[PDB]
């Protein structure tokens, strides 16, 4: 899986260990080994949510499977929770796009997973 | 909705009011309250368009509904106009990926919209 | 088409002719005209792959057609090889998401490609 967060929160407010915690929590949440989890945190972004420049985040989670109605609610509770607690971002200022990728459409190690 | 602009135009050339202008214009274009519009502008990018490093933009608009053949042609005109006037980017150097997102694949406020 | 690379490799390790090389190689690989190929490289990113902060990349290729099982494996070999030779990133630490976009969902110069 691959989780990306873009945020206007400054780099110095991202706690040490944040990418490790995300790796670990997403491994548990998706059922995928942590070896397969990629994480990407982009701070200091020029962005707005509802025309306000208060802290916000735009995120995506791509996974081959493990995407759906109930699961995405669960990911959103987990991920909004972490962004609120570690980055101090209110949950109603977070968007997360979920993508169920077909294995044939995911390249890795000179090939694809199909 | 979620609107993102990646561009090689330097940060100093992005006007301070561009995010708010995009928010308002997108709110009218989509018929959605401004509070739910998120906008993200990423300047100083290392990019090329047609092999040229003249100013260009790679963009995306995510939305639950309000996406489709005719609406997207309308959006391209609105967004090329804004990018051309505010960022001085030629409209034939602008790409916009449109995404019609399922409500169950959009997380917000600890849940999804489904 | 549109090709993006996000990587933790430093800005200084990106060869000067890298954008041009990606443009030329993707034209050959997809058969699309080079005038319509956009490339985007984002270095110095805070990211982890498999819990590790060794060099990695998260990439995407959007195209109207020319996306499929066999082609994606060919693209992966081409692009992973380019990232290994030019950015010294191991292919086993690269993900590439492929997107077959509908022509009506790709905006360009005040319209779409539909
Ligand atoms: C009339 N009305 C009222 C409230 C509302 C509240 C929210 C939305 C809404 C939010 N998205 C959205 C945001 C980010 C994304 O990344 C994404 F894919 C989709 N699309 N629609 N729409 C409405 C709406 O249309
Ligand atoms: C023969 N011929 C002629 C003109 C042309 C003109 C344009 C394209 C074209 C553009 N995309 C594209 C760009 C950005 C995206 O973000 C995306 F999703 C898709 N894919 N194909 N193709 C052709 C083409 O194939």
Q: Phi-psi bin for A50: left (phi > 0), alpha (psi -120 to 50), beta?
A: left
Closest-CA residue to B3 (of B19, A94, C111): B19
Active site members of B: 1
Q: How far is CA B114 from CA A4, A50, B24, C29, in A?
A: 22, 20, 25, 40
Cβ proximity of C93 and B59 under 8 Å: no
Residue contacts between A and C (CB atoms, under 8 Å): 96
Kindly report the length of chain A: 114
| B64 in a labelled binding site | yes
Report the length, in residues, of chain B: 114
Q: How far apart are CA C100 and CA B97, in angstroms?
A: 11
Angle at A81 between CA A93 and CA B24, to 5 degrees: 5
Question: Resolution to 1 decimal, in Å?
Answer: 2.2
Phi-psi region of B57 (alpha: psi -120 to 50; beta: other; left: phi over 0): beta
Any idea how long chain C is?
114
> Distance from the CA of C73 to the center of ligand 1, in angstroms?
35
User: Residues near B82 by Cβ (< 8 Å), separated by ≥ 6?
Assistant: B18, B21, B22, B25
| Cβ neighbours of residue A90 closer than 8 Å, sequence gap 6 or more | A54, A55, A56, A84
- The answer, yes or no, to whether any atom of ligand 2 lies below 6 A from the CB of C66, is no
Method of determination is X-ray
Ligand 1 pocket test: pick from B108, B113, B114 the residue with the most ligand atoms within 8 Å of its Cβ: B113
Beta-carbon contacts of residue C50 (< 8 Å; ≥ 6 apart): A23, A34, A35, A36, A37, A38, C93
Strand-by-strand arrangement of the C106-108 sheet: A46-49, B38-42, B2-7, B57-63, B94-100, C106-108, C111-112
Q: Give the residue ranges of DSSP H helices in chain C.
A: 18-30, 69-87
Domain architecture of chain A: domains with CATH: 1-114 (3.30.429.10)
- Does residue B32 line the site of ligand 1, with CB under 6 A? yes
- A45: closest CA among B44, B47, C78? B44
Catalytic annotation on C15?
no
Residues of chain C immediately before an interruption (C to N > 2.5 Å) = none
Do residues B76 and C107 make contact, with C-beta atoms less than 8 angstroms apart? yes
The helix (run of H) or strand (run of E) holding residue A48 is: strand A46-49
Is A40 touching C (CB cutoff 8 A)?
yes
| Contact status, residue B22 vs residue B59, Cβ threshold 8 Å | no
Which of the residues B7, B44, B50, B83 would you substitute to probe the C interface, choosing the one with the greatest number of C C-beta atoms within 10 Å? B50
The answer to whether the CB of B30 falls within 8 A of the CB of B63 is: yes
Please report residues of A whose CB lies closer than 8 A to that of C55. none
| Contact A100/C at CB under 8 A | no
Kindly determine whether residue B94 and residue C107, on different chains, have CB atoms separated by under 8 Å: yes
User: Nearest Cα to C107, choosing from B5, B75, B38?
Assistant: B75
């Amino acid at each position: 899986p691959m989780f990306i967060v873009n945020t206007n929160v400054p780099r110095a407010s991202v706690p040490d260990g944040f990418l490790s915690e995300l790796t670990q929590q997403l491994a548990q949440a998706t059922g995928k080994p942590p070896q397969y989890i990629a994480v990407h945190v982009v701070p200091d972004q020029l962005m707005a949510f509802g025309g306000s420049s208060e802290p916000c985040a735009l995120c995506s989670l791509h996974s081959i499977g493990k995407i759906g109605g109930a699961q995405n609610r669960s990911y959103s509770k987990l991920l909004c929770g972490l962004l609120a607690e570690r980055l101090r971002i209110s949950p109603d200022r977070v968007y997360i796009n979920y993508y169920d990728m077909n294995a044939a459409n995911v390249g890795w190690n000179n090939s694809t997973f199909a």
